[PDB]
Ligand binder design. Structure first.
Ligand SMILES: [Ca+2]
Ligand SMILES: [Ca+2]
Length: 118
């Protein structure tokens, strides 16, 4: 569920306010298309793709379905016992939260002119 994803980003990118990822590049935030603007945007692109794949599981609604996970220090894990939809959504969220921590965040890529730049 979105709340859990938020908590994962809060946990993997402590130095950046969690809400900074909501409207970044061509893919971070509601929807997305075009060529990713940088590595962070590519992380979002793959996350978007990941959710699309999870949605193929009947009745699997990524923003809603809750899953079991833990985030402590140097660990972010999806726990067992998650059903197929929760396991797929947790992995998409875990891997994106991690990927976000590997990419430079460029303030020039926040809230861009989508028509011109994507
Ligand atoms: Ca998106
Ligand atoms: Ca925007």
């Amino acid at each position: 569920n979105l709340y859990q994803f938020k908590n994962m980003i809060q946990c993997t990118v402590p130095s950046r306010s969690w809400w900074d990822f909501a409207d970044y590049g061509c893919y971070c935030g509601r929807g997305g298309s075009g060529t990713p603007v940088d590595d962070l945007d590519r992380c979002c692109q793959v996350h978007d793709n990941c959710y699309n794949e999870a949605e193929k599981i009947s009745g699997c609604w990524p923003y809603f379905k809750t899953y079991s996970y833990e985030c402590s220090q140097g660990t972010l894990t999806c726990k067992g016992g998650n059903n197929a939809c929760a396991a797929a959504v947790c992995d998409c969220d875990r891997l994106a939260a991690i990927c976000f921590a590997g990419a430079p965040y460029n303030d020039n890529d926040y809230n861009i002119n989508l028509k011109a730049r994507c």
